[PDB]
Amino acid sequence: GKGAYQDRDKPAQIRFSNISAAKAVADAIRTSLGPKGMDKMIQDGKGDVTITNDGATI
């Protein structure tokens, strides 16, 4: 109302950083959803290659 000034901005920034980071992951796997979605290829550092559509595996 008239007072209760919030002098700390760190909580407001960390929340907005979490919103952006969490949203990014959902946009990453949005393609692999549906009967007409496609797969992905994951190449490990060892050299292993996997081709998958499973969302937990990606």
């Binding site: 949005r30 393609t31 959803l33 549906g34 009967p35 007409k36 979605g37």
Partner: peptide, 8 residues
């Protein structure tokens, strides 16, 4: 919307 997008 996502299903309606992937199908063009």
């Amino acid at each position: 919307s996502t299903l309606a997008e992937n199908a063009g």
